[PDB]
Design a protein around this ligand. Structure first.
Ligand code: HEM
Length: 112
């Protein structure tokens, strides 16, 4: 692609002023939010609670697994991560994810 997961994470960490924490990333990904769209209370509403398995969109189409262990080129395109997190941070949480959240979320997702 044009980047590696580590390089995406390092730049978010620099923008956040702090190392990623995958424990916090796992906890934000599984949480239930009430500030965004009603039909998308969690990251897991489409991607599931196990990211090594396929997810599903809101009309039941299949979404390839987020885990790099199941879909290999995950997180190797900086523009793509920013395009999808920009869209779905807003749907689920109601605002853009901050650089610390992005760092924490990718650090957890990159190890599955
Ligand atoms: C804020 C909670 C979420 C997180 C952290 C998250 C994370 C991600 C990431 C990191 C990607 C890009 C993967 C890459 O680099 O290739 C992605 C793609 C995508 N997400 Fe999410 N997502 C979330 C919520 C959602 C929700 C609620 C939906 C359904 C409405 C959704 C649907 C998609 C789709 C359709 C793609 C692109 C398909 C693909 O990459 O195979 N996401 N998600």
């Amino acid at each position: 692609g044009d980047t590696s997961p580590a390089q995406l994470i390092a730049g978010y960490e620099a923008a956040a002023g702090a190392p990623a924490d995958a424990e916090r990333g796992r906890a934000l990904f599984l949480s239930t939010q009430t500030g965004g769209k009603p039909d998308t209370p969690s990251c897991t509403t489409c991607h599931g609670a196990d990211v090594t398995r396929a997810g599903q969109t809101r009309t039941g189409k299949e979404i390839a697994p987020l885990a790099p262990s199941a879909t290999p080129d995950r997180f190797t395109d900086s523009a793509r991560v920013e395009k999808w997190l920009g869209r779905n941070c807003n749907s689920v949480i109601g605002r853009d994810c901050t650089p610390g959240e992005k760092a924490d979320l990718l650090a957890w997702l990159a190890a599955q």
